Amino acid sequence: ETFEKQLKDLTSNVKSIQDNLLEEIITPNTKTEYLQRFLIDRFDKELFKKNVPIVSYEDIKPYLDRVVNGESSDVISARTITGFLLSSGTSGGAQKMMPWNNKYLDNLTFIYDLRMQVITKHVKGVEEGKGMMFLFTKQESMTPSGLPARVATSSYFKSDYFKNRPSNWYYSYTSPDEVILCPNNTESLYCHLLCGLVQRDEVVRTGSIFASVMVRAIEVLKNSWEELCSNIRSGHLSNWVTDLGCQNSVSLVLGGPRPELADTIEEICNQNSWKGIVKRLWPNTKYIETVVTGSMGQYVPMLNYYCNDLPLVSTTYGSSETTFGINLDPLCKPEDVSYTFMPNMSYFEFIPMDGGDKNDVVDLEDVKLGCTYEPVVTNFAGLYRMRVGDIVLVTGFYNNAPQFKFVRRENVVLSIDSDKTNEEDLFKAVSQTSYADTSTFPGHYVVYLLSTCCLVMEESLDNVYKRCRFKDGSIGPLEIRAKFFSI
Numbered sequence: 001e002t003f004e005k006q007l008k009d010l011t012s013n014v015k016s017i018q019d020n021l022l023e024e025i026i027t028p029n030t031k032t033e034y035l036q037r038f039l040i041d042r043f044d045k046e047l048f049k050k051n052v053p054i055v056s057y058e059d060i061k062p063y064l065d066r067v068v069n070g071e072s073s074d075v076i077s078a079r080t081i082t083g084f085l086l087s088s089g090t091s092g093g094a095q096k097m098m099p100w101n102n103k104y105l106d107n108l109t110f111i112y113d114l115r116m117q118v119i120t121k122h123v124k125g126v127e128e129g130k131g132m133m134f135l136f137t138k139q140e141s142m143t144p145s146g147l148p149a150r151v152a153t154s155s156y157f158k159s160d161y162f163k164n165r166p167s168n169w170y171y172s173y174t175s176p177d178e179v180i181l182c183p184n185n186t187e188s189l190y191c192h193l194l195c196g197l198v199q200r201d202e203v204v205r206t207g208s209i210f211a212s213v214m215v216r217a218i219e220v221l222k223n224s225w226e227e228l229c230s231n232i233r234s235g236h237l238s239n240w241v242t243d244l245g246c247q248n249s250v251s252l253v254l255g256g257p258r259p260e261l262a263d264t265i266e267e268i269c270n271q272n273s274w275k276g277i278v279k280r281l282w283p284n285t286k287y288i289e290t291v292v293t294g295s296m297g298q299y300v301p302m303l304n305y306y307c308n309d310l311p312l313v314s315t316t317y318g319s320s321e322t323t324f325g326i327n328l329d330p331l332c333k334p335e336d337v338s339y340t341f342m343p344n345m346s347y348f349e350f351i352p353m354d355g356g357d358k359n360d361v362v363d364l365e366d367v368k369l370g371c372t373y374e375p376v377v378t379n380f381a382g383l384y385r386m387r388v389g390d391i392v393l394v395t396g397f398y399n400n401a402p403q404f405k406f407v408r409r410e411n412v413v414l415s416i417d418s419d420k421t422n423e424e425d426l427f428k429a430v431s432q433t434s435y436a437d438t439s440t441f442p443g444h445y446v447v448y449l450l451s452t453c454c455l456v457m458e459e460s461l462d463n464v465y466k467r468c469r470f471k472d473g474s475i476g477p478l479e480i481r482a483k484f485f486s487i
């Protein structure tokens with residue numbers, strides 16, 4: 001009842017909520033160095049639109065550099081910046097750093113609570129069980145200001161928003177918090193699988209942020225099940241896991257020897273065909289929760305094979321600048337997913353990317369059906385009218401809330417995992433066509449046109465690629481097709 005009214009109000013009063021949010025954001029910031037220079041003396045929406053420039057990351061980086069280096073955040077935000085977000089996008093090989101504060105986590109947990117209600121409205125049999133969720137923490141980078149830079153979900157996991165989260169099915173995992181918080185993701189993924197297998201009847205959902213990570217978890221399971229079952233049989237975690245938090249918390253989950261359970265799992269895994277394996281090991285699973293839009297659509301056939309066509313539920317579209325919104329038709333096919341922007345997240349504007357809309361920039365409530373746009377974001381952490389670099393397509397409207405298909409990220413040419421290699425990067429590499437191969441796991445780049453040539457191309461790519469390729473092992477060695485490989 002409360003949720004039904006909440007969602008009706010959010011998607012019906014879009015214009016009013018957006019206009020009030022802009023006033024809410026701008027009013028305490030009119031005296032910042034940044035907004036004072038565009039002479040926004042008081043809050044006035046037409047003055048904001050006329051005087052405040054639409055900017056790229058590059059335009060405002062001088063201001064962000066000052067905050068990163070320790071200058072008072074009030075140069076851009078009266079809401080103190082207490083950390084930064086590392087974006088998967090880069091500017092000159094360097095990851096972009098976005099300003100961040102707890103309003104990011106206020107919005108994120110608002111969206112978690114909303115999509116939880118959307119899921120349970122449409123999917124039965126989930127509220128009495130737990131999620132086997134392959135969630136990972138990545139260690140933070142220090143900035144000269146002394147504030148940490150983290151990836152979006154790590155900024156949540158390492159906060160009390162996560163530690164002191166609510167107590168219901170949607171925030172209940174088969175993995176202890178220590179496993180989720182473990183910065184060694186090889187150890188934590190193994191422990192995720194171990195705890196999920198031990199509590200296999202309680203699993204009602206499984207997944208990860210992106211479909212690539214869900215696929216990797218299944219491949220690790222395929223390559224680790226004999227060892228996992230030996231830990232279940234003995235009641236002892238393998239010695240190689242060094243994280244103390246994992247050792248202590250997983251030992252409690254194991255409890256003692258489980259040779260009968262081990263036998264049961266070994267009998268399932270021992271089939272030559274891995275088709276439907278997820279459903280056979282976790283028979284109470286109701287759905288797979290993972291993003292399957294954008295470059296992640298390449299993994300849908302693999303996921304359907306392993307999960308025996310359990311629904312793939314792609315819930316959220318977000319970025320280091322802001323969370324955008326959620327999928328209000330969770331049980332649709334992957335190719336049909338659209339995201340309804342939520343008007344309380346940030347003030348959204350849109351630049352037309354085709355001839356169907358001839359305006360220079362338009363408000364959320366004015367976007368035209370069937371037209372493409374680049375989103376523009378004004379947020380609660382010092383970003384004013386910043387271009388996001390994504391292209392979206394207006395597919396419809398839920399009440400008065402536009403729904404958007406994610407089309408692509410501008411200039412990105414190659415993407416396997418979190419990496420987003422764009423045309424400039426592939427250019428430097430070749431000067432020092434392409435295809436993203438996923439038919440084998442791990443996926444890898446393919447540069448059509450020598451062992452050394454493969455290496456120097458990889459060495460010129462960005463840090464996200466190199467962390468995925470050499471550390472997580474989510475990308476294989478780059479291949480120049482005679483066929484040659486990096487190493």
Ligand SMILES: Nc1ncnc2c1ncn2[C@@H]1O[C@H](COP(=O)(O)O)[C@@H](O)[C@H]1O
Pocket residue numbers: 086087088089152291293294295316317318319320321388390406408409
């Ligand atoms: N649900 C989604 N579907 C497709 N692409 C997405 C989705 N969520 C995020 N992305 C992409 O990932 C970007 C976020 O990058 P980051 O700044 O590293 O958080 C977005 O701007 C999109 O390009």
